[PDB]
């Protein structure tokens, strides 16, 4: 596998420079300081310290080396977070999988990866740019990560066997889904065993009793969504239509000399509405951003009522255990507020889902709130228990700031450690690939 | 005006035998029976005696002499309900609001109209037959409904100055909306001034602090929700689209000699696949059906969690009543009550939500269940200070004749009445009509 993308820039310039162009998508937006709220319903997680919204495929390796979340590690072996975490972000994960094996990829820390992954999120991600048909300007389209074939296996379609078209979806979905860390060394599974909507993967999650943290407010055994777009998708009216992502994300576009391509710089569809949405629909561009505008707005009015329950419930669940309930206590309320969260996270994780399956969105919204309803009931009556019966008041969580505060983040303290990573480490990852040729000189 | 339909075959043939076939739809489905849920969340309404699913417009008149719902008046006094019952029956309705005028027709009980409202739900409703063009076999639709017409201008489309297609969904539009009884009189208005989503019409209905009753139960001064398909299909993504209730359940057809006319036996669009959802659509009709049944699912599943919820706060609220509670102290709690269920019940309203709107129906919910949250926390901590921290046990409620019973409800005694009133009052208003020549004899 060739992970230096640019191998690739001559024989194929149209893909290259539109697939460079993401670059352009550069606008990074803090979703922590839009929405403090997370920071309380991930308290005791590192989403609780940065958490942006997606930009371009060129931001990926840097994106993953400069969030909070993955830390400053020392050396090879420190450092919050797996391997794993490379796994999503860059073609050099093929290489590795493929010169290590799967289990000599997971294996470790994160830190270790760092002067081994250094492309950016290419040509070997999705193509099987060893066959000879792909200079020839033939996709063979592949999946490269051996995870994504079993879960795909999993749900019934194994992607050698599926269509074109299906196939368009699946290199998407190598990385667009939920998934969870397998196992000691943490390797990456979707849970997609019982199937992909909201209360399979719930039932999945209990049946191997798995948690991805406890929340330090609640000590509740939390699970965490992660951008389900492939599962959200394949349920919206859309993909029950076998319109791919790639209709609407990887347009079939011209050459300046009216040679057809698809376009790689995969961004918003509105952007190219003539080459995307027009295709299939008569409406004109104003008219289907306004009605995509008005499900964005619905399910975030929702999603703020969901969010604004959780936050009392983690918070009712901190005073009940001061107050000394028990684990026997707790354990029911920990059940629900574990299903409420889940529901929520699942529901709004894609920042696509309003367009994706609108209607999977507040439905997964709605079944949320009926557990947190549940949750903060069961916690009036155990607080009641304990002589108390006003309504428990909340800190100030009207900025991200005084959120991270409020759950006993150190920010200055986590964003020197990271700030002083950042300068000195990261160049130190780049030319060490520089000499052992990983990276192009 | 022209209330006897029979007037009309003769001229209008093809028109006059489809309408006159709605009477083949005739399965009366106790929705009581199905969802023994309502008549907690009716308590103190006659809805909780009462309710079946809609059937044809042929028997709009004896189903609205049948139900509990209107009693057994023993004079045109007499009875539990208005005359604006009527209105959305028969086009004696406009018969007699162009004889007595609209204030004139809304006096008095519904009792007094027994014998003046005898002709099935007709031309007259949706056309007017008094123009010559009709005769000649042109539409001439028409508002014969003021009050309805009143609610379009309300609404920013007059009637008049609408196109075509707007006054097809128009005429359905003046019974299948949410409504309320205005004055002392009571007469029929959409409350549409503020808009038509459910949050206009729940601030409405407060600055004018109306309830339609208070729940026997919580004491609650609840909102009724009534079958809003008007405001429910403009929401939803075919009437932003304006495909109107005649696309689907009236589709243009053939005589057995190729003349094109619109079909009036108006039911399931299903059943004529061919000549409806097909005119605009590639997928086939099991496929289509496939995905409806599914939206109805999904609905109905969160349905029957928020009706849940409601049933507990209900009870929980009459606990509270019963161990003390004061106005000032329950007042909050109603208000969540009274808003929690007005979603919901605007939500489900509707047997087409799932069709017409089905991501407006999840939202409602959605928003009904936040409210059913709060009421349910408050209610926890209210019986806290009142020395009560159990949960609260709900009567056995797995049927419909154990909810009503739990209610209070005297059945056998309400159906003996109603089932004698039946027997021999109505042959005496169609014998009175005959006299009085408003029914053919
Ligand atoms: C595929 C299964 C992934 C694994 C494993 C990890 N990430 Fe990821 N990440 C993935 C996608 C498809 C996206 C874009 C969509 C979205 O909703 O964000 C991302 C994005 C990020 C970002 C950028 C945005 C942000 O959260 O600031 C970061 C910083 C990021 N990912 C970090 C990250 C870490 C630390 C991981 C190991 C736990 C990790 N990702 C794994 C897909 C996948
Ligand atoms: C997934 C995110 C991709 C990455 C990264 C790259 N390509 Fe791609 N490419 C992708 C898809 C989904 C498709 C279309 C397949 C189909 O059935 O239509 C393609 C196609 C190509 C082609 C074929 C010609 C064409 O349709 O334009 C070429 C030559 C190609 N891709 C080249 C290419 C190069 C050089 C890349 C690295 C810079 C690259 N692709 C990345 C998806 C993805
Ligand atoms: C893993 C190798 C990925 C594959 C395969 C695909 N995407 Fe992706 N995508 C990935 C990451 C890690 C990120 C976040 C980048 C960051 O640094 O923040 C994304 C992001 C997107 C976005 C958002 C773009 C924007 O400008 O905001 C879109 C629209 C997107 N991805 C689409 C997309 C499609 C259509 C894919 C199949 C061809 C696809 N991605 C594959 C990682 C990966
Ligand atoms: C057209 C019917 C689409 C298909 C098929 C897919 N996506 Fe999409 N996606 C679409 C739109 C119109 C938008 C933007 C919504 C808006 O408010 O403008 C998106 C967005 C995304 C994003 C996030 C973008 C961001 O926050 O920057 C992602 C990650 C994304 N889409 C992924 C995605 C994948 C993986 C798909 C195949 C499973 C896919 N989309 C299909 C429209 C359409
Ligand atoms: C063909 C490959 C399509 C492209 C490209 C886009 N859409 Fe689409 N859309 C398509 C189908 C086949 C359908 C179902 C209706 C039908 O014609 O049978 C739709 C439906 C929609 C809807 C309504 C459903 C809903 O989710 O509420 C919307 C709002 C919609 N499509 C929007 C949309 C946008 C914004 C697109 C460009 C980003 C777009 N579609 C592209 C097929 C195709
Ligand atoms: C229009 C503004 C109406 C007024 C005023 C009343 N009704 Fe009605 N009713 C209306 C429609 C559009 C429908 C069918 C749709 C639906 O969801 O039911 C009905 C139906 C009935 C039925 C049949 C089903 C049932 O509940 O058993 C009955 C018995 C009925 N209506 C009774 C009724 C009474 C007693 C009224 C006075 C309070 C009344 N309706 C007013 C529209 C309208
Ligand atoms: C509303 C529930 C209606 C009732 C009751 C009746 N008709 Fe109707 N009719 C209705 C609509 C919505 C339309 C279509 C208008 C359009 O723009 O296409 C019609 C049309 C007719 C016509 C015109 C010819 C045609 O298109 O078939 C005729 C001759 C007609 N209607 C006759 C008719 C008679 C005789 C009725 C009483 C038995 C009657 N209609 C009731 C809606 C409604
Ligand atoms: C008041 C005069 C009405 C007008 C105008 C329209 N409808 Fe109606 N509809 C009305 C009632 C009172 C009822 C319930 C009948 C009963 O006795 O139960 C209905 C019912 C329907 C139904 C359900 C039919 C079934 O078989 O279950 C449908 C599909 C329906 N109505 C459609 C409809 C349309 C499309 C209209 C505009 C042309 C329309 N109705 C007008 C009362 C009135
Ligand atoms: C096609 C896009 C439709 C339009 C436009 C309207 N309706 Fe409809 N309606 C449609 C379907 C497919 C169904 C049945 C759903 C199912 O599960 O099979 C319905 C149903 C109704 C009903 C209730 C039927 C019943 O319970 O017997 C009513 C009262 C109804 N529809 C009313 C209605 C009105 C008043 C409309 C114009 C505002 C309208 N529908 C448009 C499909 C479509
Ligand atoms: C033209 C007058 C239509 C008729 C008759 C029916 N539908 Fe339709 N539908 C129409 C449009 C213009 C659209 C929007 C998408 C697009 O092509 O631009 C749709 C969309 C749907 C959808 C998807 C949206 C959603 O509500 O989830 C469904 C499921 C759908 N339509 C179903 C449907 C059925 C069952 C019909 C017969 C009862 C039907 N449509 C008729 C236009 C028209
Ligand atoms: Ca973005
Ligand atoms: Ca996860
Ligand atoms: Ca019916
Ligand atoms: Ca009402």
């Known amino acids: 596998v060739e992970a230096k993308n640019e191998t690739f820039a001559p024989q194929h310039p149209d893909q290259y420079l539109s697939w460079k162009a993401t670059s352009e998508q550069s606008e990074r937006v803090d979703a922590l300081a839009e929405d403090p709220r997370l920071v309380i ?53 093929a290489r590795l999988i493929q010169k290590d094996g799967e289990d000599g990829y997971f294996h470790g820390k994160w830190a270790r ?61 190598q990385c667009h889904v939920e998934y969870y860390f397998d196992g000691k060394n943490k390797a990456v599974k979707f849970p997609w065993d019982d199937g992909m909507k909201v209360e399979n993967m719930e039932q999945y999650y209990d049946k191997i009793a798995f948690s991805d943290w406890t929340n330090s407010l609640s000590k509740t055994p939390m699970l965490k969504a992660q951008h389900p777009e492939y599962e959200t998708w394949t349920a919206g009216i859309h993909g029950k239509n076998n319109v791919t992502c790639i209709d609407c994300h990887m347009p079939k576009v011209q050459n300046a000399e009216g040679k057809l391509y698809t376009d790689h710089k995969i961004g918003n569809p509105f952007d190219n509405f003539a080459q995307t949405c027009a295709n299939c629909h008569t409406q004109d561009k104003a008219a289907l951003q306004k009605v995509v505008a008005e499900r964005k707005q619905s399910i975030n009015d929702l999603k703020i009522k969901v969010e604004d329950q959780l936050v009392h419930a983690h918070f009712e669940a901190k005073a009940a255990l001061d107050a000394g309930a028990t684990e026997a206590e707790m354990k029911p309320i920990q059940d629900d507020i574990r299903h409420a969260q889940w529901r929520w996270d699942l529901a709004i994780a894609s920042h696509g889902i309003h367009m994706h399956a609108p209607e999977e969105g507040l439905r997964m919204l709605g079944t ?74």
Chains 1, 2 share one sequence.
Not at 63 to 74: F, I, N, S
Not at 382 to 409: F, N, R
């Open 368 to 441: 949320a709130m009926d557990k947190a309803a549940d949750a903060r009931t069961k916690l009036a009556r155990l607080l009641a228990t304990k002589g108390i019966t006003h309504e428990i008041q909340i800190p100030d969580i009207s900025t991200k700031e005084k959120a991270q505060q409020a759950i006993g983040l150190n920010m200055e303290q986590i964003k020197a450690e990271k700030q002083d990573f950042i300068k000195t480490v990261i160049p130190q990852w780049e030319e060490q690939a520089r000499k052992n040729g990983l990276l192009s000189q």
């Open 113 to 173: 990866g760092g002067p081994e992954i250094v492309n950016n999120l290419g040509c070997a991600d999705c193509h099987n740019t060893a066959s000879p048909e792909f200079a020839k300007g033939k996709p063979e389209l592949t999946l490269s990560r051996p995870y994504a074939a079993r879960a795909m296996e999993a749900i019934g379609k194994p992607f050698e066997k599926a269509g074109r078209f299906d196939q368009q979806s699946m290199v998407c979905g």
């Open 41 to 93: 319903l991930w308290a005791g997680y590192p989403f609780s310290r940065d958490y942006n919204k997606p930009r371009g495929h060129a931001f990926a390796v840097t994106d993953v080396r400069e969030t909070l979340r993955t830390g400053a590690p020392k050396n090879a072996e420190d450092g919050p977070l797996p391997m794993a975490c490379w796994s999503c972000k860059s073609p050099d994960v």
